[PDB]
Design a protein around this motif. Structure first.
Motif, PDB file in Angstrom:
ATOM      1  N   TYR A   7      -1.937 -21.600 -23.643  1.00 45.46           N
ATOM      2  CA  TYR A   7      -1.770 -20.657 -22.004  1.00 45.46           C
ATOM      3  C   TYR A   7      -1.279 -21.326 -20.531  1.00 45.46           C
ATOM      4  CZ  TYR A   7      -5.928 -18.028 -23.722  1.00 45.46           C
ATOM      5  OH  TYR A   7      -6.737 -17.266 -23.845  1.00 45.46           O
ATOM      6  N   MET A   8      -0.700 -20.320 -20.022  1.00 46.84           N
ATOM      7  CA  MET A   8      -0.148 -21.095 -18.737  1.00 46.84           C
ATOM      8  C   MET A   8      -0.787 -21.196 -17.373  1.00 46.84           C
ATOM      9  SD  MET A   8       4.042 -21.866 -17.505  1.00 46.84           S
ATOM     10  CE  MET A   8       4.081 -20.119 -17.388  1.00 46.84           C
ATOM     11  N   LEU A   9      -0.983 -21.492 -17.013  1.00 45.24           N
ATOM     12  CA  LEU A   9      -1.946 -21.348 -15.994  1.00 45.24           C
ATOM     13  C   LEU A   9      -0.974 -21.712 -14.317  1.00 45.24           C
ATOM     14  CD1 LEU A   9      -4.774 -21.321 -14.059  1.00 45.24           C
ATOM     15  CD2 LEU A   9      -4.955 -23.137 -14.768  1.00 45.24           C
ATOM     16  N   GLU A  10      -0.850 -20.985 -12.970  1.00 42.98           N
ATOM     17  CA  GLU A  10      -0.076 -20.838 -11.746  1.00 42.98           C
ATOM     18  C   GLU A  10      -0.870 -21.734 -10.843  1.00 42.98           C
ATOM     19  OE1 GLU A  10       2.872 -21.037 -13.056  1.00 42.98           O
ATOM     20  OE2 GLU A  10       2.958 -20.028 -14.193  1.00 42.98           O
ATOM     21  N   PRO A  11      -0.529 -22.165  -9.888  1.00 41.26           N
ATOM     22  CA  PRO A  11      -0.852 -22.630  -8.689  1.00 41.26           C
ATOM     23  C   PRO A  11      -2.053 -21.817  -8.349  1.00 41.26           C
ATOM     24  CG  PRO A  11       0.912 -23.358  -8.842  1.00 41.26           C
ATOM     25  CD  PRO A  11       0.589 -22.454  -9.754  1.00 41.26           C
ATOM     26  N   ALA A  45       6.113 -20.787 -23.092  1.00 39.39           N
ATOM     27  CA  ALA A  45       6.450 -21.341 -22.323  1.00 39.39           C
ATOM     28  C   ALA A  45       6.874 -22.646 -21.140  1.00 39.39           C
ATOM     29  CB  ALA A  45       4.715 -21.250 -22.050  1.00 39.39           C
ATOM     30  N   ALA A  46       7.183 -22.475 -20.540  1.00 40.00           N
ATOM     31  CA  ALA A  46       7.894 -22.623 -19.981  1.00 40.00           C
ATOM     32  C   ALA A  46       7.883 -23.528 -18.641  1.00 40.00           C
ATOM     33  CB  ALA A  46       9.282 -23.527 -20.159  1.00 40.00           C
ATOM     34  N   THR A  47       7.636 -24.901 -17.729  1.00 42.17           N
ATOM     35  CA  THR A  47       6.918 -25.364 -15.537  1.00 42.17           C
ATOM     36  C   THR A  47       8.212 -26.219 -15.581  1.00 42.17           C
ATOM     37  OG1 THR A  47       5.963 -24.517 -14.143  1.00 42.17           O
ATOM     38  CG2 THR A  47       5.444 -26.611 -16.213  1.00 42.17           C
ATOM     39  N   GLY A  48       8.486 -26.004 -14.341  1.00 45.96           N
ATOM     40  CA  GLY A  48       8.842 -27.213 -13.494  1.00 45.96           C
ATOM     41  C   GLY A  48      10.718 -26.552 -13.544  1.00 45.96           C
TER      42      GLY A  48
HETATM   43 MG   LIG Z   1       5.871 -21.491 -15.395  1.00 44.06          MG
END
Ligand SMILES: [Mg+2]
Ligand SMILES: [Mg+2]
Ligand SMILES: [Mg+2]
Ligand SMILES: [Mg+2]
Ligand SMILES: [Mg+2]
Lengths: 237, 235, 198, 250, 204, 233, 243, 196, 222
Positions: free
Chosen positions: A138-142, A152-155
């Motif tokens: 999972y990925m969870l945003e603000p 998934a990737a972030t930053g």
């Molecule tokens: Mg992201």
């Protein structure tokens, strides 16, 4: 926060996303019986002790969490997730299902977008593990938004990371082992670091696999890590 | 609830400002009774006069108020004042002395003036009461929580003009009937409407039980106001 | 046990209250004044549990004194007794009730009449020509049913009281060490300092 | 978690206005017309069912509500504010009156309770006033029939007849011309229908209009027999067909 | 011991032709010791009459509470409370203290000023309404009272006769009870007037 | 961009910055310099104490938290008192309940979580103090750096406060040498006093100026001030 | 901009801007939905858009099983959607526990609208940027559609549509019930009511759908359930053999 | 009360008598002691009827909320909810519950939650006042992996003995069969089981 | 007290005697033990009289509010659930024992509730000190598929058994009939088999028999 813009947006949350984008890059990859988590650790100075500022966090025994943005905000989220997982296990005896856990975090992050006396979280969180019916990532945003992911990737390195992830999904539609997914995670972090080549970095990998860790969350260390580092160093040149 | 650089309470001042637009209410104290008269805020033929009381309220058997301001604010305060009178009755087995009731209400208003960030009550009262310590008494309280005693007084619109007229014609040795006249004349002179007719008035007295030794509150029915309006020569 | 007597004559109310304080097998004191003045024309005597007795009296004294100063006025004897009754009525259902019985004697300046109220610890109030709390009433009520008149003078009432104290000194098992006698009339409250040998 | 507006949101302006109450009243003005007429032996409250979609089912949304067996309400302004006010009004009839005296509140006192609920939204921290005006019609043994208006400020007034919302000034004018103290209920219903036609743009029938009366007891609506002193509700909502019946000889 | 026995006392109410009667003894005692010969147990709020027997402190307190509540009623309602309504107000007031009750036996008497119908009711200490149309009894001689009333009562008695009956019921019930008596007061209530009579009775 | 966005810790700037936190960070730079460093056997805190006047005491920069743990402060001193008391309590709770000395790492996490809550609550401010935490636990010597943003990092050496950039570069340069000063308290302290010197526009470091602390394998956490530091000047 | 733009107090015109802004939030997902009533069923269709191919398609959903009998479709951002879903589930379980029978569709809707009204009146709460469409076959009322918005408004519908292209679908349906003169789809199987909904969505929006482009929830007597990709594929084929 | 649950080849069967008493008076001779907390999770109640109804009603609420959010609960999860309520409230409850359920993964399962709120997973469980008289009989006659008919026979014979000896037990024997096939309610009248 | 509930083919009937007591003493010879929860949900109680009335009025008040809120006829299962949860909370201290019967959109229903909060379901039930006398009659004559007529007869007979054989019960029989399509019918004093015989003598006294000390008129006005 509790404030809608004239066209239905929430500027404060959109601004919180900017703190995330400013963060170190982190990723997750879903393999055929588990999930892998990797993160870029910027080496500010030689004085930082190697291996000793662990970013990836465990929740219960079967869940890993990684995040980019304001690190303390992420820890705050993991504390809450741990209280939330304990509460579930206390009443229902079974360890919390990954989707169940996802919503727990989601509802909590969403609550911080309802009230004028609070700010949204300055992180995006990539998390997951193995439950009664398989692997979940999972990925969870603000904003509290979250979905299931294949990868998934972030930053800061997010765009190049997503490009690499998208290629893997195309070349391997038939699943993809935990041992491969670890190697490939080290690769993607190395390619994503390209942006920040002015400062050196350190790689952290964890995994939760039905066959490789018996469904428990486990840090990748020793030879397995070095093998993954060698693969990434090789494939970058 | 904060002070101005001048040493004034904004919200209190603005509440007082709002009251000076409400229908005028007049109280006159005579030796054998008290008069309360008030002007209803410009209405319609279709208003039910028989069941309407926007300005005159009974606090107990010996005390009444005339209201100027928000009616809904006033009902809140009246209700607590009624309760306070019964608490006193229960505690001491005597009817509450008028000042004690007035002080308490004025203290509740003062509170809103000093803590809690709520707006003041947009209400001024004229209290008309009897007890066996001071006999007939007349008091006034406004949103600041200050209160004062009077022989004759007005609140709401045109208080300045009404006050001058009362100062002119008032005399200590008056009877209630003389006070009834003075109150209606003063309202007639200060009205912002064509004619002071029955349908635009509320009227009440506190006398001596018609014939008894007791105290009686008469809240005039519409018909009686119409009658008393002809008697005094305003038809 | 403790002796608390009241009698209302035509123009005054007389209270008489035993002087002994006894704990165990020891009389600790023989000059105890079981009384608090509540206002210039209202006096309260009390008896009951060892600590509650004074605490309650003084609490009541504080409240009436506060009222007097707030209003610059003295509450009627009927008002003070209603206030007292209510306090006791609340107490009886509280966690630890005040175990105190009281007599209230007052001269009403507005009516020009003396008034005696008997109130027990439950908040049972009654207005009486004469009253007592405890075992003492088992002797004095009948004595006064015989000897008492509604038009007696203050001196006649003191004789009527002397008679009551003589009977209690004769028939009661405990030594109560005589009484302190107080008169309440239009001029307020005074103590008769000669009764033990009058 | 926690409120950061623990202060009044309705405050006095330099000229004495209570802004938020004025602005609430403006919201009432934009609202669909509702009205009430009192007769000798009844009260009628009426309003238009302005539907949001023709795919909507207008019978699933009543603007006219029973509060007690002898008291009904209608409104102009913000519907959702009305809906929650009706809930609290029904409840307060029980908690503050029926659970105490074992009978339903008289009309004025229930109106008084509703008014209090609206006044509080005018003084309490962190809230806006209600965006509605109510007409409340009722009967009770000792006061007969009555009709009340309640405003966002918490003010209430007894009326022989009145209107609120959009075309209220013209309708109040039409009502002053037509009202008298000898009106039977059927006459008041007739006037209610006439007055409403001027205020209604589209179709005017028993499906687009909503009407209810406070009349005499309906023993057929009670649900049980055998207790003779229980005679049934005086509140009655007229059916579509009952309305159409009266629109033929209009 | 029993809080409803400490003080003593009786109240009885009866209905007749266009009238009601309510009666009570005057005794206030403390066990065997009689203290007051003047303790009245009937009160009224408007045209509604209330008798209370039981612990005297609670009798006093409930009188003050119902004075309080009926005064407020009258102000808001702009009329006097009726017997049927007051009955409900007593019931709910008593039941509110379900687990810490007042130790009392209240009795309501009156005539509905609109219908003209005579009304009586009784209550237990927790507010259960006894809705009898002939007589209601209460207090330390309630057994003696039930006996007297069941024998003496007949419906539709004229006020002057109902007076004799209620008085005879009270006196003789009182005289078989060590804790009742010491004087007695009787109210004859007609829609227009109310007469109060003090009875002559044994003083032992 | 900086205008209407720094009124509280509950508002993000359009850049995604928290200015109140950044302003709290600025009080640390205003603080007098302190240095931390460690080998495998010991960890040392060195701090430059500051006086208000020539008639005044020099204010303490070092606080003991347990027998195996303590810290130095740079920034708001009363904030250091609040945070050290909390740390003393966490150390205590660990001993009493679990008969276990608190890991220096866990002390880091607890301080981080505490700071964080003040970067997200309306009506409160963030902490305005930086801390350097040394300790010896079941995995040896440790040094931590705490920023009131809630970021805590483990380091071989570091410095915080005014002109601390000198001392930091020095330590960065001397890394390979001081990490290996094992079994020699006096040499490790010497290297710490050496490090704090690269941060002086001030002057000579005196007996009133200097505050040193040590913890290690067979040494409880101990503070040196006054005459007891002279042998290092 | 004044305070009347940032919190739910009245503007001089008697409007609540935060409420109006919340309505604009409902469209941010760019998804359209429609609900229709059968003879003994109720059907919700919604678009399914999966832009990112890193997403697990099976976790992307705006349809929720609130209870055994009630389904809910949301038009609005998912975080707010899931807040509403969670509350409605909790309300549904509590009603049943307290009152001994299953919560009706309309009653849950009224309850959720009441909660929305509160955010409209209290300063510290923002409204939710969502429109909730509730469906079931009520044991007492038969097939039911009830829809709530950020104003706290709700009503029953013969059929309904929500989203950016709400109007195109609405008028399509308005035109159908004009022809049929009845207020449901005279059809026995829910499978044929699902086909009708997909068909009329296609005409109104002028778009063809694959099995991965749609999302379907069906309510019948005593169950509400969602269709799999394959159940939908079977529906798509069925329509295409004539249309 | 005589109550039991037995696992077998295809699932699990619950059984109970139908007698509730207050003293020696039979307040209800046709009670249904077999209680549903989910489609295929049922329990038999023993002890205070007030307590066990209040508990079962709450468990049912939790499992309905669970199902809305997380899907079908396992029997273990049901048992755990019961235990939580019983353990945490042991000072004011008199409740002995047997939980029985079926799911496709774990097949048939039985948990017993006696007075103090402990949990025990068992191949079969007996409880209630009448159970004491059949410990010997049940331990000698129960086998694992019995057929449906064999299991129904086992419960029938067991509870008829418990009914024969315990005055607090009796009436009809009710059973609920729990399998992949569904839920089956069975009843047996005195004239059948007394002749066994 | 004797109260009964009896199901029939198209509904449900409840009945009770009309005697209230204080120990051995009869206070009300004709009280009403049949209470309304809503128009078509009725109730009979035994035990603490104030408790049965109060718990009935409270849950009736809330059921009315529920009905208004939901726009639906109140269901018997809602009355049962609210009663049992309320009674359970108070652990038996509210001594209400009730037979609750009614009709609603889902059919007809018969339930018993006990003060500690347990409930049961059945086709016939009795409660009170007369319950055993009544149940003996019910166990003697109850059959499946009774007509309305037979059900009233059976219930009435069961109450009579309590009237004649239980000292706690007496006087009259009250009945309420609840049929699925219809208004509930409350039949007050449906049977009156206990009329007091004419007394042997009249006890009306000659006027002046009672000695009066003093007298005065009481003021009601103001
Ligand atoms: Mg992201
Ligand atoms: Mg007795
Ligand atoms: Mg006697
Ligand atoms: Mg809001
Ligand atoms: Mg048996």
């Amino acid at each position: 926060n509790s404030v809608f813009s004239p066209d239905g947006r929430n500027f404060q949350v959109e601004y919180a996303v900017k703190a995330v984008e400013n963060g170190t890059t982190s990723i997750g990859i879903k393999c055929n019986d588990g999930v892998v988590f990797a993160v870029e650790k910027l080496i500010t100075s030689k004085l930082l002790v190697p291996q000793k500022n662990v970013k990836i966090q465990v929740v219960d025994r079967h869940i890993g969490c990684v995040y980019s943005g304001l690190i303390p905000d992420g820890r705050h989220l993991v504390n809450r997730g741990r209280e939330e997982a304990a509460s579930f296990k206390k009443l229902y005896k079974t360890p919390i299902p990954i989707p169940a856990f996802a919503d727990r975090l989601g509802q909590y992050v969403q609550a911080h977008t309802l009230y004028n006396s609070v700010r949204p979280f300055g992180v995006s969180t990539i998390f997951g593990g193995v439950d009664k019916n398989g692997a979940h990532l999972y990925m969870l945003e603000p904003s509290g938004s979250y979905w299931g992911y294949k990868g998934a990737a972030t930053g800061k390195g997010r765009q190049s990371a997503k490009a690499e992830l998208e290629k893997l999904v195309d070349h391997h539609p038939e699943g993809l082992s935990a041992r491969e997914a670890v190697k490939q995670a080290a690769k993607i972090i190395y390619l994503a670091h390209e942006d920040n080549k002015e400062k050196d970095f350190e790689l952290e990998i964890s995994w939760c696999s039905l066959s490789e860790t018996n469904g428990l969350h486990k840090f990748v260390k020793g030879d397995l890590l070095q093998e993954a580092i060698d693969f990434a160093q090789k494939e970058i040149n | 609830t904060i002070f101005s650089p001048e040493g004034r309470l904004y919200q209190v001042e603005y509440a007082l400002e709002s009251i000076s637009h409400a229908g005028t209410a007049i109280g006159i104290m005579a030796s054998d009774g008290i008069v309360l008269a008030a002007e209803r805020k410009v209405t319609s033929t279709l208003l039910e006069q028989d069941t309407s009381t926007e300005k005159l309220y009974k606090l107990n058997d010996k005390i009444a108020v005339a209201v100027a301001g928000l009616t809904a604010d006033a009902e809140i305060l009246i209700n607590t004042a009624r309760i306070h009178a019964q608490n006193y009755l229960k505690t001491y087995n005597e009817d509450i002395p008028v000042e004690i009731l007035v002080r308490r209400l004025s203290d509740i208003k003062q509170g809103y003036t000093q803590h809690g960030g709520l707006r003041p009550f947009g209400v001024s009262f004229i209290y008309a009461g009897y007890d066996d310590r001071y006999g007939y008494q007349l008091y006034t309280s406004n949103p600041s929580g200050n209160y004062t005693g009077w022989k004759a007084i007005s609140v709401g619109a045109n208080t300045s003009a009404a006050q001058t007229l009362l100062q002119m014609d008032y005399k200590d040795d008056m009877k209630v009937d003389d006070a009834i006249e003075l109150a209606l004349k003063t309202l007639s002179k200060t009205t912002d409407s064509s004619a002071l007719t029955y349908d635009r008035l509320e009227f009440a007295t506190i006398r001596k039980g018609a014939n008894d030794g007791e105290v009686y509150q008469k809240i005039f029915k519409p018909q009686e106001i119409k009658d008393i309006l002809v008697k005094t020569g305003i038809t | 046990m403790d002796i608390i007597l009241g009698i209302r004559v035509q123009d005054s109310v007389i209270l008489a209250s035993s002087k002994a304080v006894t704990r165990g097998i020891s009389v600790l004191k023989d000059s105890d004044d079981k009384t608090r003045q509540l206002s210039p024309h209202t006096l309260m005597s009390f008896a009951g549990e060892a600590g509650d007795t004074v605490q309650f009296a003084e609490y009541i004294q504080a409240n009436i004194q506060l009222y007097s100063i707030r209003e610059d006025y003295e509450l009627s004897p009927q008002a003070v007794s209603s206030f007292v009754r209510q306090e006791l009525a609340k107490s009886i259902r509280s966690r630890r009730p005040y175990q105190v019985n009281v007599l209230i004697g007052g001269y009403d300046k507005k009516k020009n009449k003396p008034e005696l109220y008997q109130i027990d610890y439950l908040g049972t109030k009654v207005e009486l020509p004469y009253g007592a709390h405890g075992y003492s009433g088992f002797y004095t009520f009948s004595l006064l049913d015989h000897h008492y008149r509604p038009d007696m003078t203050t001196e006649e009432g003191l004789d009527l009281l002397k008679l009551c104290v003589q009977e209690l000194e004769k028939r009661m098992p405990m030594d109560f060490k005589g009484v302190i006698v107080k008169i309440v009339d239009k001029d307020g409250i005074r103590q008769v300092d000669d009764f033990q040998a009058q | 978690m926690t409120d950061r507006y623990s202060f009044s949101l309705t405050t006095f302006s330099p000229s004495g206005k209570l802004g938020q109450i004025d602005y609430a009243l403006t919201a009432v003005k934009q609202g669909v017309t509702s009205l009430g007429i009192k007769a000798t032996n009844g009260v009628v409250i009426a309003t238009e069912k302005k539907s949001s979609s023709p795919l909507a089912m207008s019978e699933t949304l009543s603007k006219v509500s029973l509060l007690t067996p002898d008291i009904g309400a209608v409104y102009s302004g913000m519907g959702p504010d009305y809906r929650v006010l009706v809930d609290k009004s029904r409840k307060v009839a029980h908690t503050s009156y029926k659970r105490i005296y074992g009978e339903y509140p008289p009309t004025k006192l229930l109106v008084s309770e509703v008014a209090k609920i609206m006044q509080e939204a005018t003084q309490s921290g962190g809230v806006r006033p209600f965006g509605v005006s109510l007409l409340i019609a009722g009967h009770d043994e000792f006061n007969g029939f009555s009709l009340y208006q309640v405003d966002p400020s918490g003010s209430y007034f007894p009326w022989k007849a009145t209107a609120i919302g959009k075309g209220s000034v013209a309708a109040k004018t039409f009502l002053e011309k037509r009202w008298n103290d000898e009106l039977e209920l059927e006459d008041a219903i007739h006037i209610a229908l006439l007055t409403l036609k001027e205020s209604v743009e589209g179709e005017f029938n028993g499906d687009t209009i909503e009407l209810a009366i406070i009349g005499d007891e309906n023993p057929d609506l009670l649900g049980y027999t055998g207790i003779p002193t229980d005679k049934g509700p005086r509140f009655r909502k007229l059916t579509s067909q009952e309305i159409n019946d009266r629109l033929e000889a209009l | 011991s029993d809080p409803s026995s400490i003080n003593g006392g009786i109240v009885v109410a009866m209905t007749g032709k266009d009238c009601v009667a309510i009666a009570c003894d005057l005794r206030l005692g403390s066990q065997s010791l009689g203290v007051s010969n003047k303790f009245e147990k009937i009160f009224h709020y408007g045209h509604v009459f209330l008798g209370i027997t039981g612990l005297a402190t609670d009798v006093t307190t409930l009188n003050e509470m119902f004075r309080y509540k009926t005064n407020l009623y009258k102000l808001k309602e702009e009329r006097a409370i009726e017997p049927e309504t007051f009955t409900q107000l007593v019931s709910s007031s008593l039941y509110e203290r379900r687990f810490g009750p007042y130790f009392v036996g209240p009795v309501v008497a009156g005539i509905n000023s609109k219908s003209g119908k005579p009304f009586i009711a009784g209550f237990d200490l927790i507010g259960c309404i006894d809705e009898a149309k002939d007589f209601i009894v209460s207090g330390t001689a309630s057994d003696q009272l039930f006996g007297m009333c069941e024998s003496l009562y007949e419906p539709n008695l004229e006020p002057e006769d109902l007076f004799e009956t209620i008085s005879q019921a009270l006196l003789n019930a009182a005289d078989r009870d060590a804790l009742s008596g010491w004087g007695a007061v009787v109210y004859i209530i007609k829609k227009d007037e109310v007469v109060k009579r003090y009875l002559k009775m044994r003083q032992d | 961009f900086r205008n209407n966005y720094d009124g509280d810790t509950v508002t993000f700037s359009p850049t995604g910055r928290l200015f109140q936190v950044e302003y709290a960070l600025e009080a640390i730079k205003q603080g007098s310099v302190t240095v931390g460093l460690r080998s495998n056997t010991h960890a040392v805190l060195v701090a430059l104490k500051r006086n208000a006047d020539e008639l005044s005491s020099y204010q303490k920069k070092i606080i003991k938290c347990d027998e195996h743990m303590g810290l130095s402060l740079a920034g708001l001193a009363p904030d250091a008192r609040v945070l050290s008391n909390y740390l003393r309590q966490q150390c205590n709770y660990s001993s009493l309940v679990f008969n276990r000395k608190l890991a220096v790492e866990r002390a880091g996490h607890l301080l981080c979580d505490k700071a964080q809550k003040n970067t997200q609550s309306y009506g409160g401010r963030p902490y305005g103090v930086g801390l350097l935490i040394i300790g010896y636990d079941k995995s040896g010597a440790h040094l931590l750096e705490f920023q009131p943003s809630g970021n805590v990092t483990e380091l071989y050496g570091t410095a915080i406060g005014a002109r601390s950039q000198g001392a930091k570069t020095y330590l960065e340069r001397t890394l390979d040498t001081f990490i290996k000063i094992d079994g020699n308290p006096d040499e490790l302290i010497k290297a710490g006093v050496e490090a704090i010197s690269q941060s002086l526009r001030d002057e000579s470091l005196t007996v009133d100026n200097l505050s040193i602390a040590i913890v290690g394998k067979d040494t409880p956490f101990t503070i040196y001030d006054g005459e007891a530091v002279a042998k290092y000047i | 901009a004044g305070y009347d733009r940032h919190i739910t107090i009245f503007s001089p015109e008697g409007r609540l801007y935060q409420v109006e802004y919340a309505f604009k939030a409902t469209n941010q997902t760019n998804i359209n939905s429609l609900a229709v009533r059968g003879k003994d069923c109720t059907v919700v269709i919604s678009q399914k858009k999966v832009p990112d191919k890193l997403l697990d398609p099976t976790t992307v959903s705006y349809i929720f099983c609130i209870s055994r009998t009630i389904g809910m479709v949301v038009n609005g951002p998912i975080p707010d959607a899931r807040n509403a879903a969670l509350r409605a589930k909790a309300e549904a379980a509590e009603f049943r526990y307290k009152y001994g029978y299953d919560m009706p569709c309309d009653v849950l809707a009224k309850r959720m609208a009441n909660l929305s009204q509160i955010y409209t009146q209290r300063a510290y709460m923002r409204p939710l940027g969502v429109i909730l469409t509730f469906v079931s076959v009520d044991e007492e009322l038969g097939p039911s559609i009830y829809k709530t918005d950020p104003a706290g408004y709700y009503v029953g519908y013969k059929a309904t549509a929500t989203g950016p292209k709400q109007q195109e679908i609405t008028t399509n349906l308005e035109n159908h019930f004009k022809k049929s003169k009845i207020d449901h789809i005279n059809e026995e199987s829910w499978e044929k009511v699902v086909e009708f909904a997909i068909t009329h969505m296609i005409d109104a929006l002028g778009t063809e759908f694959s099995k991965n482009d749609l999302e379907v929830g069906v309510a019948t007597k005593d169950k509400f359930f969602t269709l799999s990709a394959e159940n939908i594929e079977e529906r798509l084929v069925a329509i295409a053999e004539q249309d | 009360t005589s109550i039991m649950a037995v696992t077998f080849k295809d699932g699990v069967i619950l059984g109970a008598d139908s007698r509730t008493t207050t003293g020696a008076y039979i307040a209800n001779r046709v009670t249904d002691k077999l209680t549903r907390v989910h489609d295929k999770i049922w329990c038999c109640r023993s002890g205070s009827a007030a307590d066990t109804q209040a508990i079962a009603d709450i468990v049912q609420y939790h499992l309905e909320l669970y199902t809305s959010q997380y899907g079908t609960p396992s029997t273990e999860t049901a048992a755990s909810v019961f235990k939580e309520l019983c353990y945490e409230n042991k000072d004011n409850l008199t409740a002995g519950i047997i939980v029985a359920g079926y799911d496709d993964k774990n097949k048939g399962e039985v948990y017993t939650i006696p007075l103090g709120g402990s949990v025990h997973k068992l191949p079969y469980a007996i409880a209630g006042s009448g159970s004491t008289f059949i410990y010997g009989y049940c331990d000698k006659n129960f086998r694992e992996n019995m057929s449906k008919e064999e299991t129904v026979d086992f419960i029938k014979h067991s509870l008829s003995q418990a009914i024969k000896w315990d005055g607090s037990s009796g009436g009809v024997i009710r059973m609920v069969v729990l399998t992949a096939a569904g839920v089956e309610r069975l009843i047996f009248y005195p004239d059948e089981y007394e002749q066994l | 007290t004797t109260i009964v509930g009896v199901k029939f083919n198209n509904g449900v009937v409840i009945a009770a005697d009309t005697r209230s007591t204080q120990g051995p003493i009869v206070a009300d010879k004709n009280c009403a033990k049949l209470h309304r929860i809503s128009p078509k949900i009725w109730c009979a109680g035994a035990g603490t009289a104030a408790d049965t009335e109060a718990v009935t009025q409270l849950i009736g008040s809330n059921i009315e509010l529920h009905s208004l809120y939901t726009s639906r006829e109140p269901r018997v299962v809602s009355a049962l659930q609210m009663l049992k949860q309320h009674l359970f909370k108070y652990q038996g201290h509210i001594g209400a024992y009730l037979i609750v019967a009614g009709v609603d959109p889902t059919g007809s229903h018969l339930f018993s509730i006990h003060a500690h909060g347990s409930t049961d379901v059945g086709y016939y039930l009795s409660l009170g000190s007369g319950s055993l006398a009544a149940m003996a009659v019910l166990e003697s004559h109850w059959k499946q598929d009774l007509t309305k007529e037979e059900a009233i007869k059976l219930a009435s007979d069961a109450i009579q058994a309590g009237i004649w054989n239980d000292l706690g019960s007496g006087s009259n029989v009250d009945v309420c009939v609840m049929e699925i399509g219809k208004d509930a019918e409350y039949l007050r004093n449906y049977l009156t088999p206990n009329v007091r015989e004419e007394k042997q003598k009249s006890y009306k006294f000659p006027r002046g028999t009672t000695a009066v000390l003093k007298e005065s008129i009481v003021n009601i006005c103001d």
